[PDB]
Design a protein around this ligand. Sequence first.
Ligand SMILES: [Cl-]
Ligand SMILES: [Cl-]
Ligand SMILES: [Cl-]
Ligand SMILES: [Cl-]
Length: 278
Amino acid sequence: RAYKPIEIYGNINEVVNNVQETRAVGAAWGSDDRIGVTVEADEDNATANAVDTYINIQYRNETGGSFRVVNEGSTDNNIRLKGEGEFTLNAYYPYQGANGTLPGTEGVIAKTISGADQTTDKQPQIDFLFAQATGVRAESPVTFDFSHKMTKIILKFKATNGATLNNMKVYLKSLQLEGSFNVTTGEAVAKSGATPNSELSMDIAKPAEGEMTASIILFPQDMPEKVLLEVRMNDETYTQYMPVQNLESGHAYPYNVTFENPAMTITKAEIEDWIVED
Ligand SMILES: [Cl-]
Ligand SMILES: [Cl-]
Ligand SMILES: [Cl-]
Ligand SMILES: [Cl-]
């Protein structure tokens, strides 16, 4: 017989600033956000056609956390699970690749992070999310609970004792900028091996109102012992080494960068959950 499609929704686990709490939230998707959905396991049939056809199927955010399958031309790409058994499904964001095949190298997406990736427009393309849903039923709604698998550095700038904040050019040296995201397991990890001469740079504009901050999404990694922060501001160069730590998946690591006239100081703030810009 003809089996109806499954209906897909998505929550993202992150800090909601207006309530100051880590929550599952489905109202924080961008209007054209794309996810890839894979049927991992069919508990009734160990060697079924579902687990073979329904791999990396593209879905688009319709409104809220509600997703609709992407159909270009006269296609019907909906996932139609069959039977009364349970299924395991995986999902990830941002979608890439083709339907029926795992993206990258057997599900492993390689990427080299730069400062150009940290703009408003480009930072969502390296903000890798993963979800796994167990006990999924045929012809039913399923909600994926996505987690941010990357790590984040937040630089919070302040000026005291007569110093003034101006537009900056910020440099972070010796971080591991290359890494990979596995869409099958959700593991996001920086490549092994030290890269002491690596450099990430960004232009940070002095805002008209509020706090001046910079956020850097990176692959999770244990920072090397020496990470230099260089700031070019109002025709002056400030350099200071960072207090280093291990940068884990799903956490934000804020640093208080203060221009105390004349010194630029760096202190580590308390580890946070996934902080987003309001
Ligand atoms: Cl920007
Ligand atoms: Cl002061
Ligand atoms: Cl640590
Ligand atoms: Cl510190």
